[PDB]
C-alpha cells in the first residue's frame, strides 16, 4: 500500500469489464502498488527512469529479441502508440537483450517500427525489479501504469495490443 495508489485501483475496478477478448489475460490491480522506478536508457544512451514519465498513463512492456511472442507483438505496440499516444498516454517498451546491443535496433528497423523510440536496459535489471514485486514471471510482460507511477493492471503474456479490445480498454483507463 501507498495511499497515492488508490486512484489506480479505482481505475482498475472501473475498467475491469473491458479486460476481455484479445486482452483477457490482463490482471487488474486490486491493491495499491507503486512500481519500482525502473532505470533504463533511451536510443541515444541517455539515462531514463519511469518517474520521468509521470503525468501520463503508460503501457510499460519488456521485450527481447530472443523471445518470440515479445517480438511478435511489437508491431501492435507501435500501432497502439500511433493511435493513442498524446498528452495522457504513452507506450514505453524497454528492450532487455543483454548481448549484441545492435540486434534489437536492427529488429525494429527491419520491421519498420519507428514510433516506440528505442528504450533499453542491457543489464535486464528492470526484469528483476518487476520480478521482485511479483510482476514478472516470463516474457513478454507488460504493465499498465497510472500518471502517479502506480499499477493499474499487469499481463504475463503477449496480446494484440492494437485490437479494438485493447484500444477500448486503454481509452477507458486514460481519459
Amino acid at each position: 500500500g501507498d495511499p497515492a495508489c488508490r486512484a489506480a485501483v479505482a481505475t482498475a475496478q472501473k475498467i475491469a469489464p473491458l479486460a476481455h477478448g484479445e486482452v483477457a489475460a490482463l490482471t487488474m490491480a486490486s491493491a495499491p502498488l507503486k512500481l519500482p522506478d525502473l532505470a533504463f536508457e533511451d536510443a541515444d544512451g541517455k539515462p531514463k527512469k519511469l518517474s520521468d514519465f509521470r503525468g501520463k498513463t503508460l503501457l510499460v512492456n519488456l521485450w527481447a529479441t530472443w523471445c518470440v511472442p515479445s517480438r511478435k507483438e511489437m508491431p501492435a505496440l507501435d500501432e497502439l502508440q500511433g493511435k493513442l499516444s498524446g498528452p495522457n498516454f504513452e507506450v514505453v517498451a524497454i528492450n532487455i537483450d543483454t548481448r549484441d546491443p545492435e540486434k534489437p535496433k536492427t529488429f525494429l528497423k527491419e520491421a519498420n517500427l519507428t514510433r516506440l523510440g528505442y528504450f533499453n536496459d542491457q543489464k535486464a535489471k528492470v526484469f528483476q525489479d518487476l520480478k521482485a514485486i511479483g510482476r514478472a514471471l516470463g516474457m513478454p510482460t507488460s504493465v499498465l501504469v497510472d500518471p502517479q507511477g502506480c499499477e493499474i493492471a499487469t499481463i504475463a503474456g503477449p496480446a494484440e495490443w492494437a485490437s479494438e479490445d485493447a484500444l477500448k480498454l486503454i481509452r477507458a483507463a486514460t481519459g
Binding site: 484479445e22 490482471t27 511472442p69 516470463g138 503474456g157 494484440e160
Partner: protein
C-alpha cells in the same frame, strides 16, 4: 477454488507436448484431437496458432499433461497453471476462467533456443459458443 477442496472437473482436456508443439485431446467431447501450431499467413494477425485450446468460461477445467519425447512445461499465469509434461506420466491440475477471450503463454525468463518456442493458446468462450465449437470440432478433427 478453495484450496482445501478436491476440485471437480466439468471438462477434461489432455495436452501432449512434443518438440515443438502442443496437441490437445477432448476425452469428454468425442475424443477428437488436434495439433496446435504457430499460425502463419494470417495477416493482419500477429499472434497465435491455427487451432486453439478452447474452453467454456466459468467451468472447472481439468488439464492432464504428458510429454511425448522429453519434458515440456505447460504454463499459463492468468489461470495459475504451471505444470510439467513428463513422458510416461500423466500429471494434472484444474483451473477456472472467469473472463472470455484469448490467453497466450510466455517464454521463460531464461533465454532459450532455436525453433523450440511452443505456443500455448487458450480461447475462453461462453456456453453456447462452446457447444457449437464442439460440434464443429467433432467433424473437423475426425
Amino acid at each position: 477454488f478453495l484450496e482445501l477442496d478436491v476440485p471437480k472437473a466439468d471438462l477434461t482436456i489432455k495436452a501432449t507436448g512434443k518438440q515443438w508443439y502442443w496437441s490437445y485431446a477432448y476425452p469428454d467431447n468425442g475424443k477428437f484431437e488436434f495439433d496446435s501450431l504457430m499460425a502463419q499467413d494470417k495477416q493482419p494477425r500477429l499472434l497465435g496458432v491455427d487451432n486453439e485450446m478452447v474452453v467454456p468460461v466459468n467451468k472447472v477445467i481439468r488439464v492432464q499433461v504428458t510429454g511425448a519425447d522429453v519434458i515440456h512445461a505447460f504454463a499459463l499465469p492468468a489461470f495459475g497453471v504451471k505444470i510439467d509434461a513428463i513422458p510416461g506420466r500423466l500429471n494434472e491440475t484444474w483451473f477456472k476462467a472467469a473472463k472470455t477471450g484469448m490467453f497466450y503463454g510466455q517464454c521463460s525468463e531464461l533465454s532459450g533456443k532455436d525453433h523450440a518456442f511452443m505456443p500455448i493458446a487458450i480461447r475462453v468462450v461462453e456456453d453456447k459458443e462452446f457447444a457449437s465449437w464442439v460440434e464443429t470440432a467433432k467433424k473437423k478433427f475426425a
